[PDB]
Structure 1
Amino acid sequence: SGAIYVGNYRVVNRHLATHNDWANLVWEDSSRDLLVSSTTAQGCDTIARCDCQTGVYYCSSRRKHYPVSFSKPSLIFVEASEYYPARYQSHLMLAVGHSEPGDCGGILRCQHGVVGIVSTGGNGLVGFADVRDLLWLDE
């Protein structure tokens, strides 16, 4: 689990979105595993606007943060789960690192702020859903 709070928005994995997230829907993209909902309270996380390929991510299955090198956001074929069939997920970044299904929602951060959130994994690789291109989150 996990979410990013910026301004009047909440950014979550689309497959983990609650009934309340869907009732206050702003934007969703099934190909990216992302959903954004509106909030009453003002969030204060900072979104990174950069092309960093190094950062740190939170791994709840180990209660630890790991520093990683990750690829640039792209279109990668990912295997099926109970939430999605096997498909091409877009705006996805991979890194060598540990992850489990329950780790989805953990934030990946660089010196500039929040880069994205854990969304896919397997074979000793962890995938993150990029949020740096969503410029409207700051207004």
Structure 2
Amino acid sequence: SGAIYVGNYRVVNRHLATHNDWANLVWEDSSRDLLVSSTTAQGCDTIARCDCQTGVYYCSSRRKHYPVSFSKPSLIFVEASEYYPARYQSHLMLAVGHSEPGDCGGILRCQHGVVGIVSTGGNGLVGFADVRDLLWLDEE
């Protein structure tokens, strides 16, 4: 579990969104595994606006933050789950790291701020839904 809290927005994995998230919906995209809802309180996270490929992510199944090298956001095949049918998840970045079930929502960050949230993995893989192109998170 986990979310990004920027301005009056809460960014979560679409597959983990609550009824309150759906009832206060700003934007959602199933191909990216992302959903954004509105919040009453202002958040403290800042979004990175960059092309970094190195950063650090939080792994809840290890209680640890790990430094990683990650790929650029791409259209990458994600094996079926209980959440998604084989498909192609867009704006996804991959790294070598531990992930197991339980871990989505953990933040990936670089020197500029929040880059994205854990969305996929397995294998000694971990994939990150990017948020750096969502410029509207910084306003309104």
Q: TM-score range by the shorter chain?
A: over 0.9
Q: What residue is the counterpart of 1:83 in the other structure?
A: 83
Q: Which runs of 5+ in 2 are unaligned?
A: none
Q: Which runs of 5+ in 1 are unaligned?
A: none
Percent identity over the alignment is 100
The answer to whether the aligner puts 1:120 opposite 2:123 as a matched pair is no
CA distance in 2, matches of 1:42, 1:67: 28
Residue 33 of structure 1 deviates from its aligned partner by 0.2
CA distance in 2, matches of 1:21, 1:100: 24
Q: For residues 52-100 of structure 1, what are the alpha-carbon distances to aligned partners after superposition, in whole Å with 9 as ceiling and x for unaligned?
A: 0000000010000000000000000110111111100000000011001
CA distance in 2, matches of 1:128, 1:71: 9
Aligned structure 1 segments of 4 or more residues deviating by more than 6 angstroms = none
Q: Normalised by the size of structure 1, how large is the TM-score?
A: 0.99
Q: For residues 118-139 of structure 1, what are the alpha-carbon distances to aligned partners after superposition, in whole Å with 9 as ceiling and x for unaligned?
A: 0001111100000000000004
Q: For residues 22-79 of structure 1, what are the alpha-carbon distances to aligned partners after superposition, in whole Å with 9 as ceiling and x for unaligned?
A: 0000000000000000011011211000000000000010000000000000000110
Q: What residue is the counterpart of 1:31 in the other structure?
A: 31
CA distance in 2, matches of 1:95, 1:125: 6
